[PDB]
Design a binder for this molecule. Structure first.
Ligand SMILES: Cc1ncc(C[n+]2csc(CCOP(=O)(O)OP(=O)(O)O)c2C)c(N)n1
Ligand SMILES: Cc1ncc(C[n+]2csc(CCOP(=O)(O)OP(=O)(O)O)c2C)c(N)n1
Ligand SMILES: [Mg+2]
Ligand SMILES: [Mg+2]
Lengths: 801, 801
C-alpha cells in the first residue's frame, strides 16, 4: 500500500480542458433540479422516496465525465456503456431535463409511472425502454456485469463482428457496495483478460447508508491493497488542489506520515468540527505539521477539500485510466457524503441555494421551481456543445435492432423432426439444433455458446473443434469458457443477449450449465436480465430431480422452473423430445430475433438421459409452442383418463398409459406438456379478460381447448406446483399431480424416480385412484396395484425425507 | 508476489514429529480404498459418478492434517471446523473406513443412499446427519461460509458465550473454485476481523475439470497476489525435499528465475512426459540449470516432486500457520492432479498398486479388494494413536444440542396480541417481538440479530443503544452489522443458525433485509442452509410488490414466497397483522429451539406500511400457524362470496367486503391467509396420502376445513400463483385470484394496487362477476361496477406491462 495521498502527484496532473466556472453553474442547476425533483415528490406525501445526499457527493465526478468522457451511441458503436450508481438517478434525470430530453411533467411524475408519463426510481430499461440501459440498483451486479460487458466488447472485436475499441465500460460504485462479494470477487478476471476498456469508479465518501464502511481502519487502503494485489491500476483521488502547496512545503515528510497514521474515524470527525479543531487535533500533532498551517487562518484550513470534489483531480484520474493499457483501472474517489447539504447530511432549501449559488429568487423558492437554461444562454450552449463533441446524449436506448436476419426455417431442423435412429437426449438434440444454426449463414457468427468449465458433460466438445474456444483456442474462438463461475457466465450471456440494443448487433447467446446452478445461484441476475430486455437462451442442462441421479442434494434440480416462472418475460419449456426442442428453439429465434422482435428470453431445460426419440406428429407445431398437444389416444373400454407428462418423465407416463390399457382396459389421451408455465399464463390471461368483460362470451384457456373432462394425471421431474399451476384451467373435475418435491440424493435413476414417486407405477396408481372415486373401478384394484408395484404407501413424504 | 519456491526454507523447517515410513503405509491404504470405492460404483453401470484424481492430488495434505493438526470435537469445543473439498469425499470415507467408522457395505453403497445404508456423493449433513458438517460441493460457498464461521467463533469468545480460542477453521478449496466470485469476494473481512483462527488451504494442482485454470498464467501467483494484497499471511508449498540441494548449490539464482518464468501450461506438460523431456525443456533452458542436474540420471530428475506431496514441507506450513496471529493464513499447496495414476488422471489399475506399494496380490486386484489394518499392527496403532492425541475422529456431527432453553411463552408477547394504539407495520411488530425475546434470561444473549447495513429502514435503531453492535459498538456488542453484503450476512446467519450443532451452543439468528435480495440473491446459500440443517429466522422486510411502492422494479418483491416454497425445510409466512407476527415468531422459536428441535428455518415477510392493527381474535393462534383463519362474515341478501387476503392486501379485501355488502347486498366470509405455502404443502400431503391409502378415510386439506363452497376471490401482493397454489384444495367451484404478476414500478400504493389489479375495486368486480355467471345478478350490474370504479377493462395485462 502506498501513502495516503493522490496517486497522481500535481507534477503529473494534466491541465483541465474545461471552463470550471461555467461547468459549475451547470452543475449547480443539475444539483438543484435533482433536489427539487425529490423534494416535489416528497411533498405529495405518497411515500415515493428518492435520494439526494448520494448524488450530491458524486455530482462532480459524473459532471467531469458528461463534459469530457462519456461517448454517446453513434453510427460506429454503442458509445460508452455506463453503469450509473442507481441512487443518483435524480441527478441523471436532472441533466436530461436540462438537455431538454425530459419534460417538466415527467420530472413532476418522478417515481409515478403507472399512468405513462413518469420516471422510474432507478435505471430500468423495461420501464423506460428509450432511456435507461443497465439495471444497477441491486448492489454488486453492476461491477461484475460491467467486467463481463467489457470482456464481451473485446470478444466482439476479436471475432471481427464489430469494432468496439473506442467503447469504455464505466462502473460507478459506492465503497459500501464493495462489500458485496460480487463486487470484488471477479476482479482478477479483468487482469487475466487485460480489460483496459474497463474503469471502476469507487465513490469513497466513507459513509455507507447506516454508518461508515470501516471506522477503525482505512477502507481506501483496503481497496487499494486488494485491487493492487489483483493486478489492477489503482488511482487514488484523495485530496483537493488546496493541499498541494502544503505537500510541497512538507520537507520532513511529516505531513505524509500524519495522513497515513490518521484513520477513517478520525477523518469523519474533523468533517463536522471546525478549522480550529482541525489545526489542533490534526495539524496540531507535530511541530513540523503544525508549522505548515501557521500562516493559515481557521477559514483557510477548513477550506481544504477532498479530491473527489476537485474537477482537476478527477479529470487526471479518468484521463490516466483512459490511457492505460494491459489492465483495468480503479479510481478511488474520496468525497463527502451529504456534501453542501449541511442540515440533512425552507431554511434547508435556502441553504443549498446559497451554497451552490443557484439562480432562484426568494420569491420563487417557495414553489420549488426547476431551473432551465434558455436557448442562446451561455450555459445552454456549453451543455449541448460538450455533449455534441461526445456524439450526443446518454443514457439513451434503442429498443429494437435494425438489420433483418434470415432465420433458419423449421424445415432446416428437419432431421430433428424425424424419428432418431440412435437413442439421444434433449441435450444432444439441443447441440444438434445449435449445429443447424451454425450452418445458417445469417446467424452462424452471431451465436454465442457459453459454458462454465464443464463442457464434456453437455457433449459440447464436438463444437470445440468446429468453432473453437475464445481465448485471447484463440481470440477467434466462438465459445466462451468462463470456468467455475456461473455468475460470470451469466453476465457474459447478458452482455450478448442485449447486444442487439446496446450495439445494434443481435447476438444469440446460448448458456448451458447445470440447471441447479442457474436461477438458484444467479437469480438476481436473471431478474436484472428481464429488466434489461435480454433476448437469448438459458439452457438448464442435467435438469430434473431424478435425472442427474448420482450427484445428490446440491445438484438435482426439481425447482428451477418454479424460479423461472417468476420472471415475467422469461419463456420456459421442459421438452421431452428432440423435435419439441427443435420447434421451441425455432419459435424462440423467430419471436426474439425475427420481425416480431419480442422482448423475452427462453429458459429450456435439457436432460442427460438418452432414450428413443419418435417423429413429430403432423400439425403438432402450434401445440408444442403453446405448451401442450395430444400425443396419442390409447383405446380402452373400462374407463378413460388423461395423462400429462413433460421432460424425462413423459417416457414413463407413456409407459403408464400402456400398463393402464393393457392391464386395466383403461384408455387415455396422452399429452406432452412442453410448458406448464406458458399454459398457466394463457389461462390467467383468459380468466382476467373474462372477469373484465362480463357481457361477453367467456374465452377458453388453450389447455382447456386441448383437453376434455376425463380425470387427469400429470407427472414431471419437478416439484408438484410446476404442474398444479394449470389446475384452474384444466376442464376436468379431477387433476392429480406427481412431482419431485424434496431434497435430492444420490442413487440410480430408477431408485430416485421411485423415491420421488413419479415413475410409471405411481402414475398408474394415481390414475386408477381417480377412476375409483368416480365409481368406474373398485378401490381394491387400486390397493392391489399399490402392492403389485411394491409401492411403500407409508414411507415419509419425500419433501420431508 | 514472491519467488516460485517454498515460503519456509529448510533451515527454518521444524523436524517432522511423525513416523514418515509408517504414515506412508497408512496413506497408501487410504488412497487405495478411495479408488476401490469409486471404481466399484462405476461397475454397477448406473451412472452414479464419482471422482478420484482430486483426492489423489491432495491426499498427503489431508494426511498430515489428520496425523498432526485436526482436532476433533471434544468436551471443551467443537474442535477444528473443516470445510472439506466436496469431491474428495471418497478419501474421507476411505479414512473413516480404515479408522473403523464406516463399514465395507457402506463403501459399497457409495452414491446409493435411497435405501438407507449408503454414502452421499458429497458432504451433506441433511443426508448423513452424524458424519458431514459443511456442504461445500456448491463451489464458492465453502470459502465465504468458512470466513464467517471463523468470525462467528471469535464472536462467541468476545461475547463470553464460549471459549473457542483453541478451534481453527480449515477451508480446503481447489484453485479452479477460486474463480467463483464468492471465493475471494470476502477475503478482506478475514483481515478486518483479524481471523487468526482461519486457514485456507488451496490445492493448486493447476487445473479445473475441463482443463487448466490459467494455462498462460500462474494461478498460484495470482492467488498469492490477491490474498497478500488482502492482508493474509501466505505460505507457498511449492517443491518437495529433493529440490533442496539443487536450490542450495544454485548460486546463480537461475533455477529460481526458471521456476518464476515457467507458466502453468508448461508445468502441466512436464507431468505428462518423462525425465529426458524435463532435463531438456525445463533444466535445459539455461546453462546454469542444466549443470545442476548434469550428473543426475533421468530417473532422479523425474523423481523431483511438488511440495504438496512432501509431508515435511506440508507439516512446516501448517505448523507456521498455527503460530501466526492477527490475520488469517492461506496455504498454497502445489500438487499433481491425478497423482500416481499414470496416463491422464480391472487390471490396468495395478499401476497404482505398484506406485504406492499397496499390499494386494497382483491376482486379487480383479476383485477390487479394500485394505484394512488389523488391530495390533504398527499401522493400526499409529493411525489411532495420532487421532487420540487430537481428541478423536472427524468429521462427525451432533444433530441436536444438549442444553435446555427456557423460551418465552406466547403470553410474554401479550402486548402484540392486543389492538395497537397507533398504526404500525408488521416490521415494527417484528422488532417489538425481538425486544420481548431480549428480556428472556435464557435466550437474551443467544440471540443474534443480523442486519445488512440498512437498519433504520427496519426500525432497528432502538436495539443498538440497547444491546450494541459487535465491533471487536464494541467486542461485547450483540448485533451483527455486515453492511451491503447479503451473502456475508447470510453466512453469519448460517454459522449462528448451526452453532447448536457445531459448538453445542444454540444461538438464535434473526436476519432482516430487503426481501427482494433474499432468496433471489442468496438462493444457493438458502439451499445449502437447508442441507446444513440451519435453525433460524430470515425476515424479508419491505416485501410486497405494491407496498414498497417508490423503489420500483428491482426492489418490489412479489415473488420471494415463490422462491422460498422451493426449499423443503423453510417455513414461509406473509402476515398482515402484528399479532400474527407474534404468534409466528413464538411458534418458530418453540419448534426449532424448544424440545422438538425441528430442523427447519423460518422465512417471514414483513411490511413497511402502517395501518390499524386489530386485536387477535380469540382462538386464532393455531389458524395463524396453519396458514388461514376466518376474520369475519358480513351479511347480504343478494348473494354470498368468500374473500381471501394476505399481507398488506388483506385490509383492501376487507374494504371490498364492505362495498359488496353496502352497495350490492352481497355478503361474504373474509379470511386472513398467513401462509398459502403451508396450506398448499398440507393440501399436497393430504392428497398424496389419500392417493396411497385409497381404502381409508381421506384426509381433508386444512384450507378445505376453513372455507365453504361459495364463489371465492383471493388477492395478495404476490403473483397469482402464490394464491393459486391452493386451487386444488379450495372447495369452491369458482376461485378467482388477483395477484401482482409483472415487473414492479414506482408510484403511490394506490396507483400500484389499481395497476396490478389487486385493490378493493377489483376484488368487488371479481366477486360480482362470479355471481353474474351463476345468474345471481344481472351481468349489467358487473358492467356498471366496472364503470363506476374506473376500471380499464382493456388495459394490457400487468404481466406484459
Ligand atoms: C443487493 C442490495 N443490497 C442492499 C441494497 C440497499 N442499499 C442501497 S444503497 C445502500 C448503501 C449505499 O452505500 P454505498 O454503496 O457506499 O453508496 P453511496 O450511496 O454512499 O454513494 C444500500 C445498503 C440494495 N439496493 N441492493
Ligand atoms: C457452483 C458449481 N459449479 C460447478 C460445479 C461442477 N464441478 C465439480 S468439480 C469441478 C472442478 C473442480 O476444480 P478445482 O476447484 O480446481 O478442484 P480440483 O478438483 O482440481 O482439486 C466443477 C466445475 C459445482 N460443483 N458447483
Ligand atoms: Mg459510502
Ligand atoms: Mg485444481
Amino acid at each position: 500500500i502506498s501513502n495516503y495521498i493522490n496517486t497522481i502527484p500535481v507534477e503529473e496532473q494534466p491541465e483541465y480542458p474545461g471552463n470550471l466556472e461555467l461547468e459549475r453553474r451547470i452543475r449547480s442547476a443539475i444539483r438543484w433540479n435533482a433536489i427539487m425533483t425529490v423534494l416535489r415528490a416528497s411533498k405529495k406525501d405518497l411515500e415515493l422516496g428518492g435520494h439526494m445526499a448520494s448524488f450530491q457527493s458524486s455530482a462532480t465526478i459524473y459532471d467531469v465525465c458528461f463534459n469530457h468522457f462519456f461517448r454517446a451511441r453513434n453510427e460506429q458503436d454503442g458509445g460508452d456503456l455506463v453503469y450509473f450508481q442507481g441512487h443518483i438517478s435524480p441527478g441523471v434525470y436532472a441533466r436530461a431535463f436540462l438537455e431538454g430530453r425530459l419534460t417538466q411533467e415527467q420530472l413532476d411524475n418522478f417515481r409515478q409511472e403507472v399512468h405513462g408519463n413518469g420516471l422510474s426510481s432507478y435505471p430500468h430499461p423495461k420501464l423506460m425502454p428509450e432511456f435507461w440501459q443497465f439495471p444497477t440498483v441491486s448492489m454488486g451486479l453492476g461491477p461484475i456485469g460491467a467486467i463481463y460487458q467489457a470482456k464481451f466488447l473485446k470478444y466482439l472485436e476479436h471475432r471481427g463482428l464489430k469494432d468496439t475499441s473506442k467503447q469504455t465500460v464505466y462502473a460507478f460504485l459506492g465503497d459500501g457496495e464493495m462489500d458485496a462479494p460480487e463486487s470484488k470477487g471477479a476482479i482478477t478476471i479483468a487482469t487475466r483478460e487485460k480489460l483496459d476498456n474497463l474503469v471502476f469508479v469507487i465513490n469513497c465518501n466513507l459513509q455507507r447508508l447506516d454508518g461508515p464502511v470501516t471506522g477503525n481502519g482505512k477502507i481506501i487502503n483496503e481497496l487499494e491493497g486488494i485491487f493492487e494485489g489483483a493486478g489492477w491500476n489503482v488511482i487514488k483521488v484523495m485530496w483537493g488542489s488546496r493541499w498541494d502547496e502544503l505537500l510541497r512545503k512538507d520537507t520532513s515528510g511529516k505531513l505524509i506520515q500524519l495522513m497515513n497514521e490518521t484513520v477513517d474515524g478520525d477523518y469523519q470527525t474533523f468533517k463536522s468540527k471546525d478549522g480550529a479543531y482541525v489545526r489542533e487535533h490534526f495539524f496540531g500533532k507535530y511541530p513540523e505539521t503544525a508549522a505548515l498551517v501557521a500562516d493559515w487562518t481557521d477559514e483557510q484550513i477548513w477550506a481544504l477539500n477532498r479530491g473527489g470534489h476537485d474537477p482537476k483531480k478527477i479529470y487526471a484520474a479518468f484521463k490516466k485510466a483512459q490511457e492505460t493499457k494491459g489492465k483495468a483501472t480503479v479510481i478511488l474517489a474520496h468525497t463527502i457524503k451529504g456534501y453542501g447539504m449541511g442540515d440533512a447530511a425552507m431554511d434547508g432549501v435556502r441553504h443549498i441555494r446559497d451554497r451552490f449559488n443557484v439562480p432562484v429568487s426568494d420569491a420563487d423558492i417557495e414553489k420549488l421551481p426547476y431551473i432551465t437554461f434558455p436557448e442562446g444562454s451561455e450555459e445552454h450552449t456549453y451543455l449541448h456543445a460538450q455533449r455534441q463533441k461526445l456524439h450526443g446524449y446518454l443514457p439513451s436506448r434503442q429498443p429494437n435492432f435494425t438489420e433483418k436476419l434470415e432465420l433458419p426455417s423449421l424445415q432446416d431442423f428437419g432431421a430433428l423432426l424425424e424419428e432418431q435412429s440412435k437413442e439421444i437426449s434433449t441435450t444432444i438434440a439441443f447441440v444438434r439444433a445449435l449445429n443447424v444454426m451454425l450452418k445458417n449463414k445469417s446467424i452462424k457468427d452471431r451465436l454465442v455458446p457459453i459454458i462454465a468449465d464443464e463442457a464434456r458433460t453437455f457433449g459440447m466438445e464436438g463444437l470445440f473443434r468446429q468453432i473453437g474456444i475464445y481465448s485471447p483456442e484463440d481470440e477467434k474462438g466462438q465459445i466462451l469458457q468462463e470456468g467455475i463461475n456461473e455468475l460470470g457466465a451469466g453476465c457474459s450471456w447478458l452482455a450478448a443477449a442485449t447486444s442487439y440494443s446496446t450495439n445494434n448487433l443481435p447476438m444469440i447467446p446460448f448458456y448451458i450449465y447445470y440447471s441447479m446452478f442457474g436461477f438458484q445461484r444467479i437469480g438476481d441476475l436473471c431478474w436484472a436480465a428481464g429488466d434489461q430486455q435480454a433476448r437469448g437462451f438459458l439452457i438448464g442442462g442435467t435438469s430434473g430431480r431424478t435425472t442427474l441421479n448420482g450427484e445428490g442434494l446440491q445438484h438435482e434440480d426439481g425447482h428451477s422452473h418454479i424460479q423461472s416462472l417468476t420472471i415475467p418475460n422469461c419463456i420456459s419449456y421442459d421438452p421431452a423430445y428432440a423435435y419439441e426442442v427443435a420447434v421451441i428453439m425455432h419459435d424462440g429465434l423467430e419471436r426474439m430475433y425475427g420481425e416480431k422482435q419480442e422482448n423475452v428470453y427462453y429458459y429450456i431445460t435439457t436432460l442427460n438421459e438418452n432414450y428413443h426419440m419418435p417423429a413429430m406428429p403432423e400439425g403438432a407445431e402450434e401445440g408444442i409452442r403453446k405448451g401442450i398437444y395430444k400425443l396419442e389416444t390409447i383405446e380402452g373400454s373400462k374407463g378413460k383418463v388423461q395423462l400429462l407428462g413433460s421432460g424425462s418423465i413423459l417416457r414413463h407416463v407413456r409407459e403408464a398409459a400402456e400398463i393402464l390399457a393393457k392391464d386395466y382396459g383403461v384408455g387415455s389421451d396422452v399429452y406432452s406438456v412442453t410448458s406448464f408455465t406458458e399454459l398457466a399464463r394463457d389461462g390467467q390471461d383468459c380468466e382476467r379478460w373474462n372477469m373484465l368483460h362480463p357481457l361477453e362470451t367467456p374465452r377458453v384457456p388453450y389447455i382447456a381447448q386441448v383437453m376434455n373432462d376425463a380425470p387427469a394425471v400429470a407427472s414431471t421431474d419437478y416439484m408438484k406446483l410446476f404442474a398444479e399451476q394449470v389446475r384452474t384451467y384444466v376442464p376436468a373435475d379431477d387433476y392429480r399431480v406427481l412431482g419431485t418435491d424434496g431434497f435430492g440424493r444420490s442413487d440410480s435413476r430408477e431408485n430416485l424416480r421411485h423415491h420421488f414417486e413419479v415413475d410409471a407405477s405411481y402414475v398408474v396408481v394415481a390414475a386408477l385412484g381417480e377412476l375409483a372415486k368416480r365409481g368406474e373401478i373398485d378401490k381394491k384394484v387400486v390397493a392391489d396395484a399399490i402392492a403389485k408395484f411394491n409401492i411403500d404407501a407409508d414411507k415419509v413424504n419425500p419433501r420431508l425425507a
